[PDB]
A paper describes a structure:
Maturation of iron-sulfur proteins in eukaryotes is initiated in mitochondria by the core iron-sulfur cluster assembly (ISC) complex, consisting of the [name] sub-complex [name]-[name]-ACP1, the scaffold protein [name], the electron donor ferredoxin FDX2, and frataxin, a protein dysfunctional in Friedreich’s ataxia. High-resolution cryo-EM structures obtained from anaerobically prepared samples provide snapshots that both visualize different stages of persulfide transfer from Cys381NFS1 to Cys138ISCU2 and clarify the molecular role of frataxin in optimally positioning assembly site residues for fast sulfur transfer. FXN binding to generate the intermediate (Fe-NSIAUX)2 complex strongly increases the rate of persulfide transfer from [name] to [name] (yielding (Fe-NIAUSX)2), implying a dedicated physiological role of FXN in this step, but FXN’s precise mechanistic function remains unclear.
Symmetry expansion and subsequent local 3D classification allowed separation of FXN-bound (77%) (Fe-NIAUX)2 and FXN-lacking (23%) (Fe-NIAU)2 states, which were locally refined to resolutions of 2.4 Å and 2.7 Å, respectively. The [name]-bound Fe ion was coordinated by residues Cys381NFS1, Asp71ISCU2, Cys95ISCU2, and likely a water (W1) molecule. Active-site residue His137ISCU2, although oriented toward the [name] assembly site, is too distant to coordinate the metal (His-Nε—Fe distance of 4.8 Å), distinguishing it from the X-ray structure of (Zn-NIAU)2. Similarly, Cys69ISCU2 and Cys138ISCU2 are too far for Fe coordination. Intriguingly, His137ISCU2, which is hydrogen-bonded to the water ligand of Fe between Cys381NFS1 and Cys138ISCU2, appears to prevent a closer approach of the two Cys residues and to hinder direct sulfur transfer. Therefore, either a substantial conformational change is needed to make Cys138ISCU2 available as a direct sulfur acceptor, or one of the other Cys residues may serve as the intermediate or even final sulfur acceptor. When compared to the Fe coordination in Fe-U, our (Fe-NIAU)2 cryo-EM structure showed Cys69ISCU2 being replaced by Cys381NFS1, and His137ISCU2 being exchanged for a water molecule.
Author numbering:
A (entry chain A): 56 to 457
B (entry chain B): 5 to 85
C (entry chain D): 35 to 158
D (entry chain C): 4 to 76
């Protein structure tokens, strides 16, 4: 028997409507979209244009502003590196957040190796950047600002509209990573003053290996192409545009546009149910991230005096994720939890719960029950629990580390 | 059109209960129920006809996807016991 | 997810605690610098110097819990001198831990030596 | 058989067991509209393996009618 999937932040199941839209292009309409002389190319091109319009309609943009990529990693790379390289002559400074995704960070690391100066903005305990630091960090040679729309580990929403207003008022390009936000919360590039936006297909129940980047044309923001070739996608992403993948991404964007309100209500209700049930049973459980600016789909909880790898192993019937270092290949703890000021004792106990379009009340109740039972068992197995129950707080009692 | 809408509702529920995967089956049934109860008090015949057309398109998609999912079926979830 | 670690993590083996105030009980409390994995090991050396009872409590990954339970199983039924013969290499091969989880066995070994030490200190 | 039908009707229509009398109407007494009637008929088909035709499904408007169709078939 297969476990229950509560790991929507890592990837999503393919929506059946998306696969239904894809399948004609995986069997019959297999022509190259860049073929100009026969009907296979024309029909592939028409499907590509329809998908582009669907994505643009979801994010409220012009179709010409949408460029198809292989994923949000490629989109983030294109945004960061292309904007940095195009305006290198005058602007040599980048601003981003310490809690951004690994792609954005590593791109900033590469640009620093290429001679750029990158400012990594700190976050408060809530996980939200303070706008005063952003204003004070902007220099005359700042080209790009990158702030996550919805965090993928703790689910904290950033003030995208205010950041965009600040960036537009200072003549600084603003890029937002909307991989966890597209199709789940309302997004409009015009009202939020977004210049660049990254979209991931498999975070919105679409195909894997496909993505979109939004590039504003009024006012025009320019990027230097990172992939060289025939000049497809207006010269910013060369290579053949995969018709089934972009068709699926467009179908997923259309389904999200049709179902966002219903999905948000259901997911909010389920998230409140999960959080309240866990809090009312297990003591010493806290949620990482500010609940007032939190997307309900991504719930990060830290279970005190229990380690997260052991809890993950206990809940073998539920597919979950943790920021503990015991779950990392390099034994690297979550840097997002470090940035939000979680003490070393409590981020080894984080568990990320994911609720999405296909999560049932049946699953949430089972996950809550098993989590309560196994957290109680592991606490009965833990020495820190005895120290706390005996009244000797862990800050005043020590043991020989190493 | 009361008989037509009820027959379409019955057909969609019958076909959605045939979804091999637990997530797809539960979502399809719940969504059909909610969508039919949301548009219960719609009086414009044009709006009703548009809803029925979307309903038939969704029925065709559901039929195709249920067949595809049984052609490629996996084990049941731990919650399905 | 090796079966040997899964096996010790489920169906708990000698989980508990002993009387700290008892003269013939040695408590070993240690931790790991990289990750926080903290195991408390207690050995009851009663009668003519034999560890009849041993209990453990561990905060840590499934590998740490498996190592602590394995150490508790091994240390039982032998004198204190025989207990010091337990090494981290033995636990590592018994559990077949991956190279990333190398530190877990050494922590359990450090835990046994600590208890044996506490016991000898209280014995004089 | 009658015991199972009452439980199915009470669970599907969301009413207490005592309120489901043999002469209770699904719409007038138990408070269910056409959609709930369709779901109730479909549930009666899953619990007791059978294929109720459209006319026979339509004629089931009360608990007595439901008890009757299952006992007969
Ligand atoms: P009963 O009380 O006798 O009658 C109830 C009805 C609804 C028949 C009656 O109230 C009525 O006639 N109302 C008028 C309005 C109406 O009937 N509207 C319904 C139109 S059809 C509709 O609502 C569309 C539903 C689409 C569902 C799509 C689900 C997709 C799921 C995912 C697929 C992958
Ligand atoms: C998952 C994720 C990515 C990576 O997207 P791909 O489509 O897999 O390249 C990038 N950014 C964020 C915020 C993500 O959550
Ligand atoms: Fe560990």
């Amino acid at each position: 028997l297969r476990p229950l999937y509560m790991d929507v932040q890592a990837t999503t199941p393919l929506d059946p409507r998306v696969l239904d839209a894809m399948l004609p292009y995986l069997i019959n309409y297999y022509g190259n979209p860049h073929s100009r002389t026969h009907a296979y190319g024309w029909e592939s091109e028409a499907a590509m244009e329809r998908a582009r319009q669907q994505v643009a309609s979801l994010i409220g943009a012009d179709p010409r502003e949408i460029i198809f990529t292989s994923g949000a990693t490629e989109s983030n790379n294109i945004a960061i590196k292309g904007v940095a390289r195009f305006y290198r002559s005058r602007k040599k400074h980048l601003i981003t957040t310490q809690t951004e995704h690994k792609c954005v960070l590593d791109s900033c690391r590469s640009l620093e190796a290429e001679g750029f100066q990158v400012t990594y903005l700190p976050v408060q305990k809530s996980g939200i950047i303070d706008l005063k630091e952003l204003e004070a960090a902007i220099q005359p040679d700042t080209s790009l600002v990158s702030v996550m729309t919805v965090n993928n580990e703790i689910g904290v929403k950033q003030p995208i509209a205010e950041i965009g207003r600040i960036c537009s008022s200072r003549k600084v390009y603003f890029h937002t990573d909307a991989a966890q936000a597209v199709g789940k919360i309302p997004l409009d590039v015009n009202d939020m003053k977004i210049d660049l936006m990254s979209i991931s297909g498999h975070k919105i129940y679409g195909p894997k290996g496909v993505g979109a980047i939004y590039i504003r044309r009024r006012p025009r923001v320019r990027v230097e192409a990172l992939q060289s070739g025939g000049g497809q996608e207006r010269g910013m992403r060369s290579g053949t545009v995969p018709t089934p993948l972009v068709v699926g991404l467009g179908a997923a964007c259309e389904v999200a546009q049709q179902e966002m309100e219903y999905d948000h209500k259901r997911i909010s209700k389920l998230s409140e149910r999960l959080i309240q049930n866990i809090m009312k049973s297990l003591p010493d459980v806290v949620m990482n991230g500010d609940p007032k600016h939190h997307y309900p789909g991504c719930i990060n909880l830290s279970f005190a005096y229990v380690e997260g790898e052991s809890l993950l192993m206990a809940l073998k019937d539920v597919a979950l994720s943790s920021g503990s270092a015991c779950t990392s290949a390099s034994l690297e703890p979550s840097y997002v939890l470090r940035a939000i000021g979680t003490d070393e004792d409590l981020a080894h106990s984080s568990i990320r719960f994911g609720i999405g379009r296909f999560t049932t009340e049946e699953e949430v109740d089972y996950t809550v029950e098993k989590c309560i039972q196994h957290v109680k068992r592991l606490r009965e197995m833990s020495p820190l629990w005895e120290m706390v129950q005996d009244g000797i707080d862990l800050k005043s009692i020590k043991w020989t580390q190493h | 059109s009361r008989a037509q809408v009820l027959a379409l509702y019955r057909a969609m529920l019958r076909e959605s209960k045939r979804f091999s995967a637990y997530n797809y089956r539960t979502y399809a049934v719940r969504r059909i129920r909610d969508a039919f109860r949301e548009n219960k008090n719609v009086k414009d015949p044009v709006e009703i006809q548009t809803l029925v057309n979307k309903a038939k398109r969704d029925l065709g998609v559901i039929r195709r996807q249920v067949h595809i999912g049984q052609l490629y079926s996996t084990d049941k979830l731990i919650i399905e016991n | 997810y090796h079966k040997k670690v899964v096996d010790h993590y489920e169906n708990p083996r000698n989980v508990g605690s002993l009387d700290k105030t008892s003269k013939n009980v040695g408590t070993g409390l240690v931790g790991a610098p990289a990750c926080g994995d903290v195991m408390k090991l207690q050995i009851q050396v009663d009668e003519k110097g034999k560890i009849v009872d041993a209990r453990f409590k561990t905060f840590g990954c499934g590998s740490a819990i498996a190592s602590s339970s394995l150490a508790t199983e091994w240390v039982k039924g032998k004198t204190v001198e025989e207990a010091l013969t337990i090494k981290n290499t033995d636990i590592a091969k018994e559990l077949c831990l991956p190279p990333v989880k190398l530190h877990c066995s050494m922590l359990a070994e450090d835990a046994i030596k600590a208890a044996l030490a506490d016991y000898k200190l209280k014995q004089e | 058989i009658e015991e199972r039908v009452k439980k199915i009707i009470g669970e599907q229509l969301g009413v207490k067991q005592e309120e489901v009398t043999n002469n209770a109407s699904f719409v007038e007494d138990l408070g269910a509209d056409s959609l709930d009637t369709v779901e109730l008929v479909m549930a009666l088909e899953e619990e007791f393996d059978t294929e109720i035709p459209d006319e026979e499904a339509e004629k089931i408007t009360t608990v007595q009618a439901a008890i009757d169709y299952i006992n007969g078939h």
